[PDB]
Amino acid sequence: PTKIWRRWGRKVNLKEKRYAVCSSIAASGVTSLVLARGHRISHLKEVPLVVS
Amino acid sequence: ATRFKKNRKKRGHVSAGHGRVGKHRKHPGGRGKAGGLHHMRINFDKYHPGYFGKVGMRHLNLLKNRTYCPTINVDKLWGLLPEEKKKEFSENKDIAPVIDVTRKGYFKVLGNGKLKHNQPIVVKARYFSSVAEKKIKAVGGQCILVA
Amino acid sequence: VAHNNVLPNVHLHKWWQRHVRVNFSKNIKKKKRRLLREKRRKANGGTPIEKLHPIVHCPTQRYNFRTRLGKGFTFEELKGAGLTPRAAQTIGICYDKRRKNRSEESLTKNVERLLKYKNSLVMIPLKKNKAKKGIGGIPADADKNTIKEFRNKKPLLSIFKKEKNTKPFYETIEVSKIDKEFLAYKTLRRAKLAERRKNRRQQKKDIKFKS
Amino acid sequence: GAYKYIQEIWKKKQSDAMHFLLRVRTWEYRQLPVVHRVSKPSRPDKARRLGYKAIQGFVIYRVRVRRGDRKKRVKKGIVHGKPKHQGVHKQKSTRNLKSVAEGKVGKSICGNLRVLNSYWVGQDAVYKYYEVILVDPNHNAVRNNPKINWICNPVHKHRELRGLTSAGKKYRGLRVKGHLSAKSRPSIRANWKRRQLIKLRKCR
Amino acid sequence: GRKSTIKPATGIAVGFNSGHVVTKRNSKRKELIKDVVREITGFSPYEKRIIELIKIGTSASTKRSLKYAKKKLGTHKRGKAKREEIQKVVILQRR
RNA sequence: UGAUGUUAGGAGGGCAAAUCCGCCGAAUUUAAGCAUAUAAUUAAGCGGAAGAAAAGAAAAUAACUAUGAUUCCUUUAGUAACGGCGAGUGAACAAGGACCAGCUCAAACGGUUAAUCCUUCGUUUGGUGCAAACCUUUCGACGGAAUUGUCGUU
RNA sequence: UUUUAAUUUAUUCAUUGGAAUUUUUCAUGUCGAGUCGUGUUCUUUGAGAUUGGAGCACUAAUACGUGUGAUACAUUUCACA
RNA sequence: ACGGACCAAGGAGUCUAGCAAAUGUGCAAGUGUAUAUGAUUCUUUAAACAUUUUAUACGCAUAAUUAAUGU
Ligand SMILES: [Mg+2]
Ligand SMILES: [Mg+2]
Ligand SMILES: [Mg+2]
Ligand SMILES: [Mg+2]
Ligand SMILES: [Mg+2]
Ligand SMILES: [Mg+2]
Ligand SMILES: [Mg+2]
Ligand SMILES: [Mg+2]
Ligand SMILES: [Mg+2]
Ligand SMILES: [Mg+2]
Ligand SMILES: [Mg+2]
Ligand SMILES: [Mg+2]
Ligand SMILES: [Mg+2]
Ligand SMILES: [Mg+2]
Ligand SMILES: [Mg+2]
Ligand SMILES: [Mg+2]
Ligand SMILES: [Mg+2]
Ligand SMILES: [Mg+2]
Ligand SMILES: [Mg+2]
Ligand SMILES: [Mg+2]
Ligand SMILES: [Mg+2]
Ligand SMILES: [Mg+2]
Ligand SMILES: [Mg+2]
Ligand SMILES: [Mg+2]
């Protein structure tokens, strides 16, 4: 019988979390990778795309 | 994750990997640490030799905060200083550093390793060993006792 | 047991399932606690919800170099600031009737703390627009202009926190001042070898003084 | 005052005067019922030290309790169990005889009132004698007095069956502090339960 | 170990008078009641036995008095104090 | 001083239990058998309360440069210690946090005057409601309790 | 519709009681008893020449006293309450 | 030698604690932000983000050995 003291969550190291966020921002700046995720950006000019 | 467990590979086999002739029964040798000294003797003796019996005096109410004492050797003693600060003392020759190790969490200075030749240093602490104090004296330093 | 393993030790032999407790609401409860102590502040109407505590040392050779907050000033420390134990309670000042001052350093430290606190508060009259002197060491009341122009500042809560240690761990000395004829290890060992008879002589001094 | 002299006299109990007085007092208590009311405290100085006051709603009762040990309740003295549990004739009770005296009058006879304290008035080979102070929580004399009307609040019902009198404090272990009574607060069972607990993080 | 109240500490960790070097910082009604009560109550039986043993006046009787008091009260200290008090009483009665 | 009273005014009794307080009290099981030990200061049994209960303002720690009523969380620590020293069992002080609060009798002192308290019967001020009702109010009279001790000071 | 923070406004007159420190003095009081404690028996605890509780027998001192400082004693020093 | 007249649905190495070996990842004489607190966090969010405006909470590691005073 299922119990409520099954270990539901996990603990994650802080440095690995930060590293992953950093590596995920960097991937947001490559045109090829963004296209391969399913976004239709064939008419964009720059992939970082800063706006005023 | 149940996806990767070993029991799923035996799922069409009869005995689940435990054997036709010797079954998987429940406690066929005792419970916990049961048979030590009778029929588990060989395991106990070759893996945990000094297990049985008692030796020594009793100490009835310990209070471990009375004897707490972390230590440090003389090797790590110039390394408590920043490198640019370490550079300045090795250049000038009429000044020496005075280091208080209790402010860093150490209580007793211990005497393994080699201090730099002809580089005086003054060290404050609560306890010293004989060899450490001799090594500090030899290069031209001094030990100081604090409380 | 059969392998090179540590010998088992688990203390699960009673009915352990009846009391197991999983903590599903730790962050919910801290949100609730934060909201309650925030609600108290709006009910105070300007006065802080914290109280002043002294600075004391920790009791053991493991911690004696550290300080922290204690539960209240002593009678002598309050009299050094011209305050009374009863009147002080009506301000955010804690009183401890059983701590003692064995040295001068703690006395002066806590007296300076009390004096600094007593200089940085403005008193609001009991009945509006009726300003009177203090009593029992309480400062005199303030006028409405100062009350108006201090209600718009930010209250300082840093006076309620323990002091922070800034003592350095190295220094510089001149080579000509180093002492060379000092023996630390020998002194340490002769100090231990001498204690028992010195205790005996102190006890005999005590006997002589009593009579 | 007068009370200091009574207090110093009652510290002897083996002088001829006090021996005579005690013998005559204990003779008379046997002829009376097991639970009877007295019109006044027979030891006024001792009653003042406990919370007795001369106010409209304070009353006194006297109880008689039998001495010794009670036998274990098994038919024909036969135990079905291990030899470590076969004992009978020297089983001893957790509660005092003073607490039992308080409970003899506090449960049903005077369920209308509240027990405050009690004190010793004599003994004998068969019985010990006690006098019990009670308070009436519905009289306006106690209900208007600021010093004593804590007793009129319902959380103080049947103190002598929940261990809340002085005699109850004695046998629960609350008269000693520090390293000799380490595991007794806020109660024995609560302390046990706290130490049995397994606490378990969500993330671990 | 022991310290001294005068004479400040030496800044050494071990020994006598050791440690950090902070600056150190430094009825008539009763016997009226006694007389009234005593003439009301008198002495107890074990007190009377101790009194006569003292009144004998030898050293063996003294040791016997100590043992008897120690038995009745159940404590060496207590018994010694009781014998001293009875000795004062016996001395005073002879004057 | 007991008793009596369908005298006037009042209280107790039963139900419910997850959490809480007090008593009483096993064996299965483990030790590869079993008697101490373990299961367990547990299950069953009997009493008593609240929105919480219990605990609580030192006849407490320490041995330091000293802390400072109770409760709970993180650690101390599977440690000091208990045990056919076998199987097994098992706390406290210091440290970091939540919260934070202190008081009354007894005893001492007040006799050109018990100052104190309660029942019943009156009467007197302002508010709120459609009404029903409910706040606030200091004056008196007769009667009783109490010096075998109420109240004030500390 | 609740309940609670600021902000806005007092004034001139009347009486009797209380309370904190500061100066000079005298007075040195009281402080919980068949209770604590000790012996013995049984339980309970990690508590071991016995941790708490209980039954029976004996039974204190007066603050210069009494209790605690984890091994049973005798003579004492010190700290804490 | 034992079970099986037939058909459909159900039906058995899992969960938690504690230790070790193997392997992947991060940092490295250090490493792990405990309980808490903070925030212009607040459908989701019981998640995520932060750390007290020459810097002594605690664990494991950085030093062993002895009944032990200790070294
Ligand atoms: Mg096969
Ligand atoms: Mg098979
Ligand atoms: Mg076979
Ligand atoms: Mg049975
Ligand atoms: Mg029993
Ligand atoms: Mg068996
Ligand atoms: Mg078996
Ligand atoms: Mg069997
Ligand atoms: Mg039950
Ligand atoms: Mg009921
Ligand atoms: Mg309560
Ligand atoms: Mg804890
Ligand atoms: Mg560890
Ligand atoms: Mg034992
Ligand atoms: Mg147990
Ligand atoms: Mg703390
Ligand atoms: Mg009085
Ligand atoms: Mg006292
Ligand atoms: Mg047992
Ligand atoms: Mg101690
Ligand atoms: Mg067969
Ligand atoms: Mg068949
Ligand atoms: Mg199927
Ligand atoms: Mg690994």
Automatic annotation (TrEMBL), chain A:
Top-rank lineage group of the source organism: Eukaryota
Family indicated by similarity: Belongs to the universal ribosomal protein uL4 family.
Protein name per Swiss-Prot or TrEMBL: Large ribosomal subunit protein uL4
Species name: Plasmodium falciparum (isolate 3D7)
Boundaries of the shown chain within the full protein: 104 to 155 of 411
TrEMBL record, chain B:
Stretches for region Disordered: 1-37
Gene Ontology biological-process entries: translation
Bias-annotated ranges (Basic residues): 1-13, 20-37
Coiled-coil ranges (or none): none
Keywords carried by this UniProt record: Ribonucleoprotein, Ribosomal protein
UniProt domain Large ribosomal subunit protein uL15/eL18: residue ranges: 71-144
Annotated TM spans: none
GO molecular function: structural constituent of ribosome
GO cellular-component term (any): large ribosomal subunit
Family: Belongs to the universal ribosomal protein uL15 family.
HAMAP family on file: Ribosomal_uL15
Annotated protein name in UniProt: 60S ribosomal protein L27a, putative
From TrEMBL, chain C:
Region (Disordered): 194-211
The keyword Ribosomal protein is assigned to this record: yes
Gene3D superfamilies with a match to the protein in the record: 6.10.250.1480
Gene Ontology terms for molecular function: RNA binding; structural constituent of ribosome
Keywords associated with the record: Ribonucleoprotein, Ribosomal protein
Example GO BP: translation
Gene Ontology CC entries for this record: cytosolic large ribosomal subunit
Ranges of biased composition (kind: Basic and acidic residues): 204-211
Segments of skewed composition (Basic residues): 194-203
Highest taxon of the lineage: Eukaryota
Keyword Ribonucleoprotein: yes
Protein family according to the UniProt entry: Belongs to the eukaryotic ribosomal protein eL13 family.
Name this protein carries in UniProt: 60S ribosomal protein L13
Automatic annotation (TrEMBL), chain D:
MF (Gene Ontology): RNA binding; structural constituent of ribosome
Superkingdom to which the source organism belongs: Eukaryota
InterPro entries in the cross-refs: Rbsml_eL15_core_dom_sf, Ribosomal_eL15, Ribosomal_eL15_CS, Ribosomal_uL23/eL15/eS24_sf
UniProt KW Amino-acid biosynthesis keyword: no
Positions with a binding annotation for Mg(2+): H80
Gene Ontology CC entries for this record: cytosolic large ribosomal subunit; ribosome
One BP term from GO: cytoplasmic translation
Pfam families: Ribosomal_L15e
Keywords, comma-separated and alphabetical: Metal-binding, Ribonucleoprotein, Ribosomal protein
Record family assignment: Belongs to the eukaryotic ribosomal protein eL15 family.
Listed name of the protein: Ribosomal protein L15
Native source species: Plasmodium falciparum (isolate 3D7)
